[PDB]
Structure formats: structure tokens, C-alpha cells
């Protein structure tokens, strides 16, 4: 087939999922697993290898069950999109509203074979245009193995798009949530590898604005009572400070989104036509660039 | 000159807002018409970027490694 | 005096036995994690130039093995009695040393009996008296952090703030050595009172259930509000229960640290040798 | 044993809650009478798994090995 290589950057993936219609979703980069995050939809893992040396446990699932979204990657350079779709398409529609161009795919491929389910991914044009719309201009062609960790029902499924079978880990203890079982499978590893790990959570702003409602209602419940002539001003003080805290948090979130938008608008632009015209305009008057190495 | 001539310069520092501010307005405007959608004063990071620097480096390399002299009219 | 085990629980029970009720000593694991209103810090080593008027409590430690008492009294007695209620037998000392010379204020420390009995009351039976854990106390009076060293003759000052003091304490961690198993603790007020206060300021909203009915001739389905904030109430409840359980733990470790087990061991072994059931498995 | 009879044992493991549960009640009570004020027939297993209990047994073998506390110890 042939797709475009992409930079691994949480902003690029967030804007990718926004370009997939799935708005109430987000990908933040996790630096340590100990700090908890609320309601993670699923994790994504990335290897690299600088010196190749590679030329890239029997817990596979043998039964021909394709009820879960698993698809062998047939489309090259589609690693990232395949991983994102792997972490999204195996979640609860109750918990999240996925984009219609995504839900159409998820309901289209009911029980399809993976070897052509990934081909169903490759054939969707409104997906290839959005994934290819973020490639750097140096993708003038004519690493980063992705592994998706998502549970379906109390079973932590490690989905590998290149391996033929999905790997299950089957962790269930009624004392711990699945995020506790995810860290136990993080027994990694350590030489010169530029690995990276990201987390797929829902858009934080949706959980923030709701808290601004559930807070500003109590901000609105100010019962000033007069007996015609107890004192809980400190309560409205504390909850008002909370309101300000979440306000600055939300502003930080929208600033992160704007930053990702800037990095995306610069990552796409092809500077060549800009540089030539620039240099000729200097060599017209200011020929002498004495910054030689 | 795109014929492997004086390609060994540090363009990332050569192309700064100061060297940019050494150009007439009716040329700076034509310049920003070739800029990204950050077109709209100048947002100093506009010429200090990872992608802009790697761009200039892939440019001087793209000139030294293989000449893009007028031979380059292949389609 | 007698050496003591360096353990935040031991110091908490020490200050509780000193009448200081609204106090606690927790160990700080990272400076980044903020803690509310720290009354003063204590610094401990294990392997080893700033400035008259000595009206403030900087009593030179003359009594050996009194390091812990020296540090705790150094961080407490330079705070506001308004902010915290220290035991009357402690405040009597605090007012008993108005402008006294430090070089003999520590002798006033040594003379106080309820201090030797309470401080020595927690020593292990192995307190047989016949490089070390040097204590350094950090307490501010007014925006100026004096580093109080009981062995050095003068207290070292580090500077002020900018209003943008706990922030200034981290600024003093630009120290390189060169090899040391140091450790640092923090003197905060008893967490449980700040918990119960939040249980009041929460249970009032738990009590404000404005049930209005539109079934007869902003307000909407807000059951989830009382649900979530009720879960918060339960969270702080479990916090308080964990704290009082920590106090129980300190009481157990204290009741066992003091006990002299030898007389128990003799009777145990002799009760085994009564019916000849020796330890013919374990050895060496 | 005043000075040196079977002092080379690993007492910390010899004195466990099981060997305690191998004693008659009218002796186990006498035993808990020599325990700290955490007295209040079951045994709170952590009662015999402590740093201070082990350090007690070790300073005990030291008090036996290093210098005997035989009736010689009447230097007072």
C-alpha cells in the first residue's frame, strides 16, 4: 500500500484523534506509572533501535475469536494509527462517544478476519488523509514498533499489530483495578534504546468543566440569612480557591492544545521555497554571511 | 547558489529575526507568505524551532550531499 | 542523658508527653510535595559564615545524648504560643528564659525533671553509658531562617523570601559533600484536627440537602453531587482512621521499645527445660 | 544457665509463637504476664516479630557471650 512516516509526539496523536472525529479523547505521555491518572482508556508502548542488530512467552490466543478489534498491520507506516484504533475500538461506547467515522468502522468489521481487518483500516480514505496530513515534508520517499495495552473485560489484552495473535495477560483481583495489573506487566527491561510510553485518557477538560459546574453551583448557593438584625465564610473561601485552581488548570490545558496546534502547523510546512527566496533576498544586498564554521 | 557553494554555514543562526529585520517590508511580506499558518508581532520561536533547524540542516545537507543545481528539473 | 531511637513516632509521642497536643512530626520524602504550615525542620547526619542579642532560644547543648530534645525544643520554643498550645510545664520554661544566656539555658533544660523522666522514659534498656546523628534545627521567626546548630556557637542565617519561607528552605539545598546517610524530618501540627475541621466544613454541605419538588403546583438532578462529595467525606474519614491507627502503632512500638525482655527470655527457656524440649535444630 | 550452656543457638527463631502455643495455659498466662502492656489466649503474631524482640535476644547472647552475667556481676 504505502503510507507516510510520522513523528511520535502526544500532541500529534491528540490532533490525530480529533481529526478522527473522536473528540472526548486524549493522549498524555506518562513519565512514571506511580502517579495515578483518572480513567485511562488504554496504554501505548513504543520501542526503538539505533544500532539495528534486530531485523524486526506463549500466551497467545489460539481460538478463532475476532470479536475484539485485532487487525494484522498490512499497511506500512500505519503503526501509530493502528495502535490508537487498537486502544479505542475495544472500549465501552457507554464510557465514550467515538467519532462517527470511527464507529462506522468498528461496527463495519464485526468478526472480520484481522488479516483483512487491517486492510479495512488501510482502505478508509478519510483516515489515510488525516494520518498522512501530519507527515513532515521530509517524507519525500519514493523503527517505532507499537504495542497496545487494553482490557476488554477484566482481561488485560496486549495487542501487537505485527504478531499474528493477540497476547492476553488475564489479571483479575477484586482488590485492585486494572491499572494496578498494568504496572505488574511493566517489568521492563537496558542499553541505548530510545523507548517511549504513552497513555490514552479522556480529554481532561471534560472532567474539568463538569467540576466547574458542580463547584459553581455551591458558589451560587450563598445562603445569606438575616434574623431581622453559622458564619461559614471560610467555606466559600476554600471552594472559591478550588474554583481558581481548576480555572488555571483548564487554562493550562487549552494552552497545551494551542501549543500542539502550533507544533503541528510548523511540522507540516515545507520550508524550502521559503529558504531560497530568503537567501536570494540577502545575497541581493547582504551577501556577506560571516558565520562560517 | 544551489551548486554546492558555501553550504558549510550555520544557517539556523544566519536566519534570525535580526537578519530578517534587515529586509524591506514589501519583501518581508512576500517572505511570510511562504511561512506556516503562524503567519499572523513575529513570535520569536517562529525561527527557533526543532523543525526549522532540522529543516535548514536537511537543506544544506540536501545541497552538499547531492547537488540540486539546474539539473534538478526532473518533473 | 540517654540515647534515643531516631523515629518520628518516638518524637510524636515525646511531644504528646510534653503537653503539646496540636503537634506531630512526619518524615519528608521529597521537597516538591508541599505540606501545610510546617512549624520547623530537623536535620540528621550519619557519616560526616553568618552571625549580640540572644533573646531567642538557642540554648547550647551541654547535656550529651539530648540531641533530639534539643532539636524539638529548638523548633518549638521559637514559635507563637498563639498558634499552638504547648504544655504548661513547657511554656513555664519558655517564659523562664527571657533573654537568658544560651550557654547556660541548656543547663535550665538539664534541671527540668519532667524532661529527663519523659525523655529517658523512652530509652531502650541498652542505654548503658560509659560519625553520629547530629541534629540541625530550622525555624523562622520573621522571614529569616536561622540554622540552629546545638554544637556550633552561633546560629547561621540564610536570608528572606519574596512573597511569591518553605520556598526558601529548598533554596538552601545547594549543598555538596565531596558518603552520608542523612535524613530530614518536619514538625507539623496534628493532622487529625485539620481533618475533623474538614469533616465539619464537609458535613455541613452533606447536611445542606435542599430537596425541592416540582411534582406539585441551576437546580436539576444533582444526586451525583452529594454522591461524589459524600465519597470525598468517606476518603477523609479513612484518612483520619489511618492517622489514629498510626498513633496506635506508635503506642505499640513504644510499649515494646521500653520493655526489658531478658526476664521474659529466662522464664521461657527454663519453662522449655522443664519438660526437656531443647532447641536441638537451630544453632550457630 | 549463667555463663556458657548452649549459648550458640539462633534464639530469634527458637522463640516463636508456635513453641508458645506448645505450652499449657496455666504457663502461657504466666508468660504473657512478662509481656509489655499490650497484654490485652490468642497471640498477636507481631508480638514475637519485632525489631526490639530480636535486638533483645541478640543483646542477650552478647550479655552471655561478651561478658557473663554470672553471680560475678555483683560489682555493685
Residue numbers in the entry:
A (entry chain A): 44 to 99, 109 to 194, 211 to 257, 264 to 303, 335 to 398
B (entry chain B): 214 to 253, 275 to 309
C (entry chain C): 46 to 93, 110 to 112, 116 to 194, 210 to 243, 246 to 259, 266 to 304, 333 to 399
D (entry chain D): 214 to 253, 274 to 309
Article sentences:
With the goal of understanding how PR-DUB activity is coordinated, we have solved the crystal structure of the Drosophila Calypso–ASX complex to a resolution of 3.5 Å. Two copies each of Calypso and ASX are present in the asymmetric unit. In each of the two copies of the Calypso–ASX complex the globular Calypso UCH domain is linked to the C-terminal ULD region by a coiled-coil hairpin. The Deubad domain of ASX packs at the hinge between the coiled-coil and ULD helix of Calypso, restraining the ULD in a pose protruding away from the active site. Whereas Rpn13 consists of seven helices that wrap around the ULD sequence of UCH-L5, only four are defined for ASX. The crystal structure reveals that the NEF-motif sits directly adjacent to ubiquitin in a putative substrate complex. Using size-exclusion chromatography coupled to multi-angle laser light scattering (SEC-MALLS), analytical ultracentrifugation (AUC), small-angle X-ray scattering (SAXS), and chemical crosslinking we demonstrate that Calypso–ASX forms a higher-order complex in solution containing two Calypso and two ASX molecules. Oligomer assembly is mediated by a conserved patch on the surface of the coiled-coil of Calypso, and disruption of this interface impairs recruitment of the PR-DUB to nucleosomes and removal of H2AK119Ub marks. The bidentate Calypso–ASX complex from the crystal structure places two C-terminal tails on the same side of the PR-DUB, with two DUB active sites approximately 60 Å apart.
